[PDB]
Amino acid sequence: GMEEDIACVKDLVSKYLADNERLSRQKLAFLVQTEPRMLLMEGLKLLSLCIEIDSCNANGCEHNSEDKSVERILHDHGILTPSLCFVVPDGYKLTGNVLILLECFVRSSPANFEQKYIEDFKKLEQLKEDLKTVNISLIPLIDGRTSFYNEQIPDWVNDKLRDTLFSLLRY
Numbered sequence: 001g002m003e004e005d006i007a008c009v010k011d012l013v014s015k016y017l018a019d020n021e022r023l024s025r026q027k028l029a030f031l032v033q034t035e036p037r038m039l040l041m042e043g044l045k046l047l048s049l050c051i052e053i054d055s056c057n058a059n060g061c062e063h064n065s066e067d068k069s070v071e072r073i074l075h076d077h078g079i080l081t082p083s084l085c086f087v088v089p090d091g092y093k094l095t096g097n098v099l100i101l102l103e104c105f106v107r108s109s110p111a112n113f114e115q116k117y118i119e120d121f122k123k124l125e126q127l128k129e130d131l132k133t134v135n136i137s138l139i140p141l142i143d144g145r146t147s148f149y150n151e152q153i154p155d156w157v158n159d160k161l162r163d164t165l166f167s168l169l170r171y
Contacts (some may be wrong), residue, residue, distance in 0.1 A: 009164045016157040036168040043165045044065040050152035052090050055104040055143045061091030081134055085126045104143040117144050132158050
């Protein structure tokens with residue numbers, strides 16, 4: 001019933017998720033869930049991951065899979081920093097003293113898109129000023145999207161997945 005619908009949406013994902021090794025852990029995280037809330041959560045994380053991996057691949061950035069702060073990233077490259085505002089980017093790339101940072105987001109309604117853009121922009125611009133004092137040049141990239149569509153699953157499957165996972169909340 002609920003077991004039947006849960007089995008069905010997993011079946012949907014097994015058929016259609018691209019055969020990409022970088023998705024394997026999170027795909028399995030999704031497939032092992034038996035409760036609707038847990039299933040929803042792991043399904044949204046899978047779609048988020050697909051988007052982040054695409055955005056990083058497009059922009060040549062390392063994907064920030066461990067949610068490292070900027071301070072942590074720089075410290076891992078031997079770079080010490082003053083107190084920075086806390087920022088966890090989706091992707092990064094350090095080349096000498098030039099740091100590229102990438103955020104990506106989804107907002108399907110334009111008013112929200114514009115508000116969130118300003119939100120991410122402000123976080124990133126705070127860093128830029130502060131890194132300048134340690135002669136790190138920040139290159140802030142914002143990849144704002146209007147849907148959850150991505151290269152790892154068909155768009156129609158994407159829609160059906162999200163729809164189903166939220167609905168299951170029926171149980």
